[PDB]
Write a protein that binds this ligand. Sequence first.
Ligand SMILES: Nc1ncnc2c1ncn2[C@H]1C[C@H](O)[C@@H](COP(=O)(O)OP(=O)(O)OP(=O)(O)O)O1
Ligand SMILES: [Mg+2]
Ligand SMILES: [Mg+2]
Lengths: 553, 398
Amino acid sequence: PISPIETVPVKLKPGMDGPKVKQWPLTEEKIKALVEICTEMEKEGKISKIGPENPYNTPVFAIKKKDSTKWRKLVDFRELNKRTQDFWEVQLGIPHPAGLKKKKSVTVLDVGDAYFSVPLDEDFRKYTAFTIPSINNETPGIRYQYNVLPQGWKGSPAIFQSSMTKILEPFKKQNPDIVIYQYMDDLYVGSDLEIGQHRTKIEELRQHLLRWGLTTPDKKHQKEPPFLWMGYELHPDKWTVQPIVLPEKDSWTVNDIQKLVGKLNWASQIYPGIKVRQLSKLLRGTKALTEVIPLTEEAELELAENREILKEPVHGVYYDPSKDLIAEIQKQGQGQWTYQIYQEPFKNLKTGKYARMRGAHTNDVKQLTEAVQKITTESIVIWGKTPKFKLPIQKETWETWWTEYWQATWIPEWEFVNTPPLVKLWYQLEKEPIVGAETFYVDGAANRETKLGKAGYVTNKGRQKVVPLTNTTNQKTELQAIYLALQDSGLEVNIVTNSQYALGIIQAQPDKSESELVNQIIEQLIKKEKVYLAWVPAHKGIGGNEQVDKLVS
Amino acid sequence: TVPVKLKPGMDGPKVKQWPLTEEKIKALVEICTEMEKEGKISKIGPENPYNTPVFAIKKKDSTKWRKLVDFRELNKRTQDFWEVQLGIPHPAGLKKKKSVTVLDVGDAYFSVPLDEDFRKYTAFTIPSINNETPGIRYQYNVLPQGWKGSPAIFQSSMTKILEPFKKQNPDIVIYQYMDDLYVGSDLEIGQHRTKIEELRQHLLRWGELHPDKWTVQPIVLPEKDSWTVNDIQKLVGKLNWASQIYPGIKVRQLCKLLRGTKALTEVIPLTEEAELELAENREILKEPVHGVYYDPSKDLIAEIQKQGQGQWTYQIYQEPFKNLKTGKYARMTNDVKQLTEAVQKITTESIVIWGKTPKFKLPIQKETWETWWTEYWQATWIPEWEFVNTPPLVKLWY
DNA sequence: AATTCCCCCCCTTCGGTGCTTTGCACCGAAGGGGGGG
Ligand SMILES: Nc1ncnc2c1ncn2[C@H]1C[C@H](O)[C@@H](COP(=O)(O)OP(=O)(O)OP(=O)(O)O)O1
Ligand SMILES: [Mg+2]
Ligand SMILES: [Mg+2]
């Protein structure tokens, strides 16, 4: 029934009226389902008949519920939402079973008719008016208005969550030794005490809820393991995701590729080693969601690997506050990382992957730091404490990186682990000039009208060469000049440039880039054994740097 | 109460609450539980569209958690600040005092009720561990701590309690920026503490800085006998940039030995023209640049740089290439902790000197800063910071 | 050619912003997908 809880005062945005949308022609089965539903609801006072005094209207339809033989009646409140006042949602995240503790007794409850058991503000009911049609336009239609929270309204979820919290507060105040994970209307009540006392307390909770209108039907009340909770199968000592079925097709469209990447990201939290880089690359540049895309022999290998991985049943474990959180990170190549958070060896609380590509140019250390931050900020949410990392990076490499980088870098308490692919810096630029090495005065120019440029590398011993470039801006010509200086040189080399752009790219030791020129720079830099890069102001009378300026111009 | 109002045509704070550590949550639902019994805060629902981040900080050797609300955004749109808008207008003699002390008048703001039509903006949400329950929303009934309008309202209650104290001791200058009392005396340190407890006793009954050690750090050129081609090349670049900040620097006598396509590790034969130009340019760098004046109509900008081995460097300025103050913070392992301590020291120096927190430009990635900056913060106020990515050009500040 | 609403996540695209280097690198919002109620 309708709860005696107080009604949250809602109002429209200033200067806005109510919706006046018209009803679409509905199908016969949906019309019959709506008429059947809007009769039981009307008898219980959840909706009320109206007439000419109400000029508002909003389309209504009915989708099929997750369980068959039941219809969910929704209202297309898309013009009312544009005029409703703003809300601050109180749901800040999603509970995870890895953060649960090992409770001796567990019960999962589901409130029946969750939204239709919370009253709606009396001054806001006139706007939520709708019109059930008559079948074959026999009658002109029956108009109703909502006395409870509508489904499809912007403010309904927050209002219901706050009402449920207020309802549950006295019970949790009386019983502080019982854990209750609430998510909308799904309740996970876990506690100590034997099965008899736990069932007695569950009955007390159900009576308390029934005193507040909310009813918990016996069909949605689970008392024995496994418990289907929030997409997971909670067990007494482990947990698992509900079975994931990947699409199996011989012709892949654009839309069905992202219906496979999405189900792999979800599966990549208890399943270790899931990669979606090659599959996701297939979505770059596509236009239509029905465009057939052929697999590129690299997405097929990833698909086979992920299909093999999903074939073995894996399980998680529950949190233990009297134990230490450990997180291991491993490299996968091409900027992909796989991490697992555990407390005991070979018993993972959680798994995950990080493959985001931030910035045009990067290296392994920066991506490892980003993965560390992501894991830290996720573990803070789930367990409320940072874990101890076991990174695949040497202490000396991290030291040489953070004591020489021009940015503040820190990662928490961490221990080096030696598991093949290691994070390292491929090349380093010497801070001092190298004696007995040819000094390379490079420059590059490009007219900003016809997109023609030239590069020059005139050096100490007398060597010089000017190379023309087509369709290059003022920066690509400089990068080409550096590339050509690096190419025609021995092992030890000193390169002096006149702009900050190339230095800023090169100084932060990139090992992979989104531009082919910087990539060629990187593969050349690793080949050399000693490189010294220096800056010089361009048009300040500096000979050599000015001699090459004439050469490139 | 006072009719607090926002700027013409401004909505209000709508910031998302960041996740908190389990220690900062167990010690935040306890503070807020007791704060609600006394009526300081009250529960609200989702019908209030506004929000503000909240977190707890354990102050210096206090062994107690203190709730801190990041009112940075609400300060920007409040703009009431009219009741004695000056807020104890900045005494120019505060920076010249031998020693000043910072005292936190915290529980004094929790006695004057906040205007009813304003408590909706001072709303915050307390997160839950593993999202067990939806966040608990609260709003302030009394004047909050950290909001710029709290000192501006409590002004005609602190100038009265301090009246029988600062009248007996005219040689003490007391400043209150946001929530802290900057009492700047001039006596001996031993007598300074005695003069502090008397003020503390005065505060109770009626309900360690040293600004004498601050100076600007100028750019210094190296002094070496052997001069290689690279060395002049670095100096020319440094002098070329130094010209725009130190007008009158000439490089004609120095941008002449770099003429040609010679080597870069050979020793240059320094001439008399360069030698005279070197000494002349050094003397201009000796005296700090004059002609710069603080304009209270424009906001200050800070710029921290990392120099390694724990050394940092900042340049507080209002317009580019016109520095009002430069300094070097030494080390006090951790990198974010040092930067966090650097921001507090610069902010404390800026408040003492100009009374305004500068707009910082941190040399750190955003995701690294927001993850850890609340762990080492220990000050009531929070400055507005912007993140930058600029490699060191020519090492032009150290 | 079906039409709804909130929350978290990932992946790609496009426009705005800042510095100057009138291109180029970053960032955030919006589209798609997954999961939950
Ligand atoms: N597709 C949806 N569109 C709009 N609101 C939804 C949707 N799914 C769920 N909700 C909201 C409204 C529901 O009242 C609330 C709880 O979901 P759910 O438990 O599935 O429904 P219910 O409690 O109304 O019916 P039941 O009797 O089957 O429990 O979540
Ligand atoms: Mg359900
Ligand atoms: Mg239900």
